[PDB]
Amino acid sequence: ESLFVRINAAHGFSLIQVDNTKVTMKEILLKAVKRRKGSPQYRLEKQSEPNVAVDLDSTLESQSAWEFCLVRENSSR
């Protein structure tokens, strides 16, 4: 099995494959938005820290987390 991150979104969850923990949170966000919404702005939040946008330029490793919420920027989880 590959490594993957769980993304909780407004209408379900997506498991997003990652090759390694050096992937950036930006890459994970773009994959989750593409799959769930197709062609509004979004943030990712650590599951255990509501209402705070993760730094999209940081690595997955730096988050010390494997579950995130995908939240529309004009909304809440």
Partner: protein
């Protein structure tokens, strides 16, 4: 409101994700991105009665076969999908049905046999063979195209009707 947990299963590449996204978003997914697992929730009206569909889109990749237990236990109806141009995917249908039995003690769960990609001219799985398989299981057979949307609502809505009629 009432929520129905539907699960889409079948071999790699048969079109489980394309079927799901055609239903949910009225869009055909052209590229192949292998699934690990994804869920999609949508409010729909079936036979004049509103409900919430919770569709679980699953991995064909055998690397993720261990997941089957969790989602087969709580799944309330199953689309068992093969592709009409992929005889191996048709052969694989039985394995999904048998795993559902390992956890439900029976296969007495709403299921539809789905022959997808029927927009393609080349077919290697005969219609009569798919019909006969569904008959041997006591379940409907529905031909679909996630590309043209042929049969897509029929496949998913048949599951909901079968749950409602238990």
């Amino acid at each position: 409101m009432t929520e129905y947990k539907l699960v889409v299963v079948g071999a790699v590449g048969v079109g489980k994700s394309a079927l799901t996204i055609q239903l949910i978003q009225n869009h055909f997914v052209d590229e192949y991105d292998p699934t690990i697992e994804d869920s999609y929730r949508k409010q729909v009206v079936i036979d004049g009665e509103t409900c919430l569909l919770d569709i679980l889109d699953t991995a064909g990749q055998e690397e993720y076969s261990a997941m089957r237990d969790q989602y087969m236990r709580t799944g309330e109806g199953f689309l068992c999908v093969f592709a009409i141009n992929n005889t191996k995917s048709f052969e694989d249908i039985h394995q999904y049905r048998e795993q559902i039995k390992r956890v439900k003690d029976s296969d007495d769960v709403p299921m539809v046999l789905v022959g997808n990609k029927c927009d393609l001219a080349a077919r290697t799985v005969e219609s009569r063979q798919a019909q006969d398989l569904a008959r041997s299981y006591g379940i409907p057979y529905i031909e679909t195209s996630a590309k043209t949307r042929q049969g897509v609502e029929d496949a998913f809505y048949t599951l909901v009707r079968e749950i409602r009629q238990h």
